[PDB]
Amino acid sequence: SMTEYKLVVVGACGVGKSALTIQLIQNHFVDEYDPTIEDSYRKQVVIDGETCLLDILDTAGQEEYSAMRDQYMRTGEGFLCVFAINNTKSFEDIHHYREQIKRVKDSEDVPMVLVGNKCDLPSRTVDTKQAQDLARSYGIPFIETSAKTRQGVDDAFYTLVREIRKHKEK
Amino acid sequence: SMVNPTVFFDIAVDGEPLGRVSFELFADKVPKTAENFRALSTGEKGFGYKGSCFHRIIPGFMCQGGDFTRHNGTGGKSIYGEKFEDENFILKHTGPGILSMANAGPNTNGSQFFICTAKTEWLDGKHVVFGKVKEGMNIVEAMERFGSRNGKTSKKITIADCGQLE
């Protein structure tokens, strides 16, 4: 049999939400920035021996249109919360995204993964310990990724599915 | 108008003529912003809109264009430099035909702009309104039909020619 998971990718503008999604779906990376309005993708994978369909909603970094963003969060089962390791403000923004998800879904325990993207770059401003400490404070995993080299891309999405499955056991 | 300049765009669809859209630019109330768009429409500074694309068209909302530097929706530049401040918010997004500046947050006006195809009042106070379609709203409605929910157009919509009307 299989299962299906609604995954939602959120985070500040330009952190690599789409590049991570496109690596997962289409196995390529481009330097050109194509700013998102909204896109959805589907992919069949096997995670821990269990086949599933991933429904990935790639959201824009903006946080206006609360009516639409609240609906994203209501429908979503797990959330990739992405920042870029060379953008301190995008790391500081993570708290707001998490608070909105908890509010909309009426829960302190929502499946989430903290993703520190662009780890290929030499311009780091957020160190790993900072991110691990933040993820620890939330009780969620932290995954370092590069959409450019594909480092950690599968891990980030697969870990999120593992988080959903753990939550469903409760 | 006795005071406000009129500029035009000749719109093309994969290079084929679609029609002409003309705009009244509200120099009487938004002079710096209107002058930027006027000059980018004549090309008199040596750069401007001619040849550029309406890269983001979303039915029910707007037609956005004006990136003649990166040619991919991320670029743009004003006649004052890469960016200039929000001049005022005197005018509001009151319905179809309103011409307003696109931006990346406060005080980041460059060359990108959008033409509303409906009232977009949630943009009031955030985007500087500086003109309106004078003639050719039917051409804007025709452009809107090449858009999609995520803004991607099914055919390439360009400003094949543009300039100022006497």
Ligand SMILES: Nc1nc2c(ncn2[C@@H]2O[C@H](COP(=O)(O)OP(=O)(O)NP(=O)(O)O)[C@@H](O)[C@H]2O)c(=O)[nH]1
């Ligand atoms: N070096 C490097 N560049 C990356 C990485 N991920 C994304 N980029 C670059 O960063 C820019 C923005 O990436 P993108 O995936 O579009 O970001 P986004 O978070 O989807 N932006 P938006 O909120 O507008 O949709 C692009 O130029 C992209 O190539 C990465 O891991 N490494």
Ligand SMILES: [Cl-]
């Ligand atoms: Cl907007």
Ligand SMILES: [Mg+2]
């Ligand atoms: Mg994106």
